[PDB]
Point group: D2
Chain length 429, copies 4
């Protein structure tokens, strides 16, 4: 061949609009501290509220923080007079009418990826635990039985981990798994840049053939529904292990149960199930919830967990920071980036030295001529910069205008409030 | 001024190579025929393969033998492989006519009368460090398990209870692991623990070069103050006996974790039990106890064995394991290789290096082209004039090289002598066998 | 004693066309740039050298985008004849060769490649450290003149030696990693407190660095503070037989002080890539006493490596400069993306899907005065504005707007109306 | 069942050594020890010897055969380098000489066979220069890659030639290491650190360091490498192993680096390849013929026919065999060898000796009072141990080791319960033995 070119590899201005924050479902303390440090008055609750007690409280509330339990429907959101934004201190947002919340000009924020590390660590733990049958050993000794067994108990070093879904969690797991001396194969429907010395594989069937531990880290889709069933378990190695901390639908439990009973699968660890209790309870996990529970809990070397993949102080702490920060930046700067129901819109902060500069936050219906109106109303002042984006029926305009005194604020606000397309207005000075 | 850098203390690397060595001479025993290996207590298959490939006739057993059936078998046996259960006392070893060496396919050797075995010229070998990785992995698993209360969660769901709890459940990342004893296991654990994102403090009675970004601490009390997880990897000594007790638990953080896969004596269980009940210790994992069953059994772990068992098993987030730290196919496999190899090299080359009861003695192999060269293996009483006698008896032949070392009352001489034909072997053997100091002789030709 | 606590928080798009494109490339811009432009259909004129102000003005009349380097000077004089010029590409760090203020006022966005050369300068310094440490230059020169001088005296392994990095920027920090990899201790002085990479240690005073370092290398910009910052007093503060490496700026080292220090056996060697005065062209006898009074004295000294500003002179560097800038121009021309521009408001919008038929992108550079958006948004009122962004850079400002439901008919109209506006500086419509 | 989960394939940090402080053994007779050091042995060696009480004579240069013979009469240990030739002629006058230290790689300057027959153990430092050669090559790779030498030479003659054409970042380039030994392997790590891919051809299969890949044929390495560097010994197989056919197998604009041996590269082939624009540059530290002393006009057509043609070429780095020419290298050579001699003199430890049986014994504790160490070099003939072990029969031999090296052999023995009285006796008896070549007693 021939030697050829190697491959290419100022303190900010504090904006003013008391602010009322209501937090439900035991939001982490980190969230509470962030809000209080900004002056906001914070109401905290360890549990949800009934539809009655809530409506009375959401009348005056400027920002509500919820989790998965509190359902915010059109019914309960219509009484929200001053509500600026909703914080989902969790992954899910189904508990909120996004479409409606949008139409009233309420921005919703969540924490999708705060639990990645917590699920990865759990899987390392579960790999070692299954490999050595810790659960069984500890249960035996607790009932007074001494069963010292080395047969088909393994060092994880030199074993192969099959990661189905190389996302946020799958990729973090990859690094840890290599660190613990595992070979890492991964099947994904998308071609993804491997971390460390991991190897992407063309077919799930190849992964199942060559892996000792198979773990799922995929979302819920028709493709993932019962994607691990009799045929897949038949394609896996004799005495291999199945780990599902992904979704309750992705594994066919009765197939797994047969495979385990047939001495084909040496053990498994499930964090998620097709049907799960709505609350913590004593007789919650039974044949009424899942027909096969009593059969499943009969099997040896099966680790069962009540959806604790992201159940850590770290996870809840960073969820508290991520979301509390998101709401704070939306309230203080109108920053709607990362919003799940809103146009994503932001502008560089203003310097302290930019005296007499107001920020216009104008959520409006996405129809022609609205900017014509607004920029006419602001024509008397120089627009340093502005940004407008649309999300279906709704749209959001941020504009920084210079040379406004206390006098002209009241005027500009009133004029914008009287506009045809207006859904909500805030002025930050 | 710009000066010579300090010379690298001992920071040189070893690129392992297929080393073109002059093919070595395969030595065979004299004055004997076929070799008899007896293996008890279900020694790994790797050991069996190694022995058969040497020509040895192998007798295998999944269990021990009674003192009766054993004495009958050890009469003819050239090498015995045992584990912890089979006790080889003066009583049963005195009947051992042909016994060359004992293999302890395990850490412990207490099950063997070493002093006596020595006096009869029997070399004992074991596998002290074959289980390091297996114990290290277990501890990573147990750290995560306790951190998240997996055991409890899985037990709840099995009894039908759904208890999703994040309160005082932790990511191990950013937490501190306190390693008491930075030996073979402690140091392997250090690397894994950093990989899992843990800070690693370690207290040891000896100053030790840290691996990765681990930090040695002056006092145990410092480690206990600053650690989230405390794990012991120390031998059994009067200094380690109940070294973690009420005062130590009192020095540890609120909601800290105690892991003992070291020795059954090193933790004061009733202090731990108090500490756990006092909400001081959030969880613990024990693999070892002051008293343990001798056999697997369903009623074995009870108040008769340890007064506090029924109280201990009453506590939440306590992982209990029946001494499985090294209970893996890998561990047993490499134990089989390490020890089987050790016995093979002792039987075939007289190599006694790594022996626990013997002088450690070896010589470089002989080349294939060194025809008519015999290796004299002469275990003898460690008294003056013995070498005078032996080297007199060999005087007719050139001694290429010899090595003699002493271990108290007993001593071992290896000697390579050149220009010996079948005729002179029988003579040299007989003369050496009739010597005053002789305890045992073998000639390899 | 304490409590177990929560750990600390962790440390197809639519191809838009203007409603032939002419690229002029001067000063031997890398081929990567040429290929990027041609693949987009643009007609490319290439030249290995600059043009004279006469031949240039004739060519820049029709040119849509010009790519230059440091030599070609684009003044008000030559830019005023630029009829169709959309953007300027500086395929190099410097932009002083361009009247930015003027280029801005005509609505011309200027782009450059500031950090494309980091790796190339870092590698050079590793090379020069080892070379000075062992006196390679001297040894090879001796043997070439027939002299055999096998010398180990005050020749060093770099392992266990200390590198003093003055200025811990893009280059300083890349150098830090390599230097540790080669077994060097890394001290660094900076005027700002900066997070160390690997196991490097920041030092409070330059004086401390100079006291404790074996090799001193500068990676600082040109400022009044850096001007001759290494002089007699600094060399006096350095270790006996220490080494000075300057691939930063020509002004930052006092050459005559260095020369005295070297002659006084205080500095064992040095490597300079940059000088107060440098030739404008490659030539024989270009580097002489006419250019720098001390050259003939400097080139008289042993263990001094001199290089003609080659810090970033590698196929890699030129290649990635070609990609970075050609890409920048392409995205500005094709999408109006002005992010990373040195003279312009930084403005961009997410690309439009292939499925977004009948959507036009309005690129409206205008004077930064009140009422302009009022006018523009009035003129566009007949169509829904999906999204728009306007930012200002002093006297000038830039508005990007995506409008939906426009047929060939209405484009011509909207263009004309916007072109007739009071504040207009330049308009393009992407359809 | 595609397969089954099976046993994974079967595969301590440094600690303050808690051993019973060892007994410092002193020679019987040898009242004061005489060390002679020639050819400017590093100061580290001098310090080691003086700190042990030895009287040290130092010289920056060699001695003439006359001045030397007069000095080697009384000398207990001599330290030399490559220049001082120790022949049968000059060694026969050596009355008290215990050991020779070669503070360098080569030992050809010493009659080993003869030195052996007189019972003189010779030691050297074979691998003390590994790091220094590895660093040089990294430097030379970057220098060739960027043409530093040329650039600096141009500017010195007043020429400003700013060139990026066929000048490279080393990152993403391939280094071909011919010979993955001590130097080759250290170079591998550094080269990866500098972002280079590392192929290596060796005649022996060797465990790769980092992410380096061993290659089956030299021809493969030459095809795929951007920089080729040799780190091989001098053998008939290596003689002119890189010639026209090899350069023809290399990439257009590739680079050749030889800091191995002067015989391994065919210079006139390289010169043609360079002139044919096939090789973009090269760096040679070694040549078929080299001056014996530093001098002006030493490197000329009289020494190598092609010099004047070679020095005419662009981007060729030439060095006068400086691969190991660093203060570090000389320092660690001084330590390695001085230590070796000290341990041989103090403990009879002959491990690492080039002409001797390699023999050693664990040190004796301070608590082992009245234990003498017998060092008995003797002719390798039957009945010698019979004699020695007879002579020592009155005492318990704790341990002894005897090994043979052709005609000569070496016995170390630790004997217990000897008082000053019995030492003089045992020494005399052993000195009068038929096979004796030399005896020392350490108490
Ligand atoms: N157990 C818990 O408490 C817990 C906590 C957090 C997240 N999770 C869930 O675990 C899953 C993984 O989360 P994440 O953030 O890593 O997800 P992600 O969206 O970041 O990554 C998922 C990956 O799976 C791949 N994928 C999708 N469908 C696939 C298919 N049919 N076959 C193969 N690969 C497919 C995608 O390409 C993607 O790379 C999600 O369902 C997530 O909500 C569980
Ligand atoms: N649970 C199991 O099945 C299992 C398996 C193998 C080993 N072990 C046991 O675990 C322990 C560790 O094994 P290893 O092979 O790593 O041991 P080791 O000898 O390698 O390590 C012991 C370390 O502890 C240090 N030490 C000694 N006394 C100490 C004290 N009082 N306080 C603090 N440090 C002290 C030593 O200096 C050394 O660093 C041993 O007791 C071993 O028998 C248990
Ligand atoms: N020789 C070449 O061919 C070549 C090529 C590219 C860049 N460079 C030049 O090298 C220099 C470093 O490049 P970079 O991209 O890393 O720069 P950079 O802007 O990333 O970093 C400069 C650093 O120097 C610090 N600094 C400024 N003034 C200082 C002072 N008086 N004392 C100490 N520290 C001070 C700054 O705080 C900053 O951390 C620049 O001048 C650059 O133009 C040279
Ligand atoms: N320039 C200097 O001042 C200097 C300094 C030290 C060493 N050296 C020389 O450089 C070489 C490197 O020394 P080292 O200590 O690394 O040597 P080494 O013995 O550690 O390694 C040499 C390697 O070459 C391999 N080899 C042997 N013959 C071969 C062949 N024909 N083809 C391919 N591989 C072959 C061997 O298998 C071995 O891996 C030696 O010749 C040494 O004398 C030069
Ligand atoms: O964080 C998640 O995964 C959820 O959406 C569950 O909601 P929660 O925080 O448990 O109320
Ligand atoms: O398990 C080990 O390795 C031991 O040290 C003792 O156990 P065993 O005798 O093999 O049951
Ligand atoms: O700024 C740079 O990158 C330079 O080296 C000077 O300009 P150039 O690219 O060489 O024309
Ligand atoms: O390469 C070598 O080390 C040599 O043999 C040269 O000997 P020296 O140390 O230069 O006297």
């Amino acid at each position: 061949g021939a030697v050829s070119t190697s491959p290419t590899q100022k303190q900010p201005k504090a904006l003013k609009p008391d602010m009322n924050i209501l937090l439900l479902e035991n939001v982490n303390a980190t969230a509470i501290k962030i809000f209080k440090d900004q002056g906001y008055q914070v109401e905290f609750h360890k549990s949800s509220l009934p539809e009655d007690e809530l409506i009375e409280k959401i009348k005056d509330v400027h920002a509500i923080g919820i989790r998965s339990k509190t359902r915010l429907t059109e019914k309960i959101l219509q009484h929200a007079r001053n509500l600026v934004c909703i914080g989902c201190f969790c992954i899910g947002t189904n508990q909120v009418d996004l479409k409606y919340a949008a139409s009233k000009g309420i921005a919703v924020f969540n924490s999708p990826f705060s639990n990645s590390r917590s699920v990865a660590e759990l899987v390392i733990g579960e790999i070692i635990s299954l490999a050595r049958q810790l659960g069984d050993r500890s249960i035996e000794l607790h009932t007074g039985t001494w069963n010292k067994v080395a047969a088909r108990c393994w060092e994880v070093r030199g074993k192969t981990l099959g990661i189905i879904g190389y996302g946020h969690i799958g990729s973090q797991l990859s690094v840890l798994a290599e660190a613990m001396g595992l070979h890492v194969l991964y099947y994904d429907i998308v071609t993804i840049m491997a971390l460390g010395t991991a190897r992407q594989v063309s077919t799930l069937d190849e992964l199942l053939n060559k892996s000792d531990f198979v773990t799922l880290h995929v979302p819920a889709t028709p493709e993932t529904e019962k994607m691990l069933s009799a045929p897949q378990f038949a394609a896996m190695k004799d005495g291999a292990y199945v780990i599902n901390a992904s979704r309750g639908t992705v594994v066919d439990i009765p197939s797994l149960i047969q495979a385990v009973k047939a001495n084909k699968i040496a053990g498994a660890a499930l964090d998620v199930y097709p049907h799960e209790p709505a609350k913590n309870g004593e007789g919650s996990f039974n044949d009424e919830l899942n027909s096969w529970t009593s059969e499943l809990v009969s099997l040896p070397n099966i680790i069962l967990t009540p959806h604790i993949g992201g159940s850590t102080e770290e996870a809840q702490s960073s969820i508290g920071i991520e979301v509390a920060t998101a709401l704070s930046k939306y309230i203080n700067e109108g920053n709607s980036v990362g919003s799940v129901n809103f146009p994503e819109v932001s502008l560089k902060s203003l310097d302290y030295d930019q005296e007499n500069t107001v920020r216009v936050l104008y959520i409006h219906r996405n129809v022609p001529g609205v900017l014509k109106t607004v920029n006419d109303i602001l024509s008397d002042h120089n627009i340093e910069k502005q940004f407008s984006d649309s999300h279906g029926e709704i749209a959001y305009l941020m504009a920084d205008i210079s040379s406004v005194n206390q006098s002209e604020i009241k005027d500009i606000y009133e004029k914008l409030n009287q506009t045809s397309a207006k859904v909500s207005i805030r002025l930050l000075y």
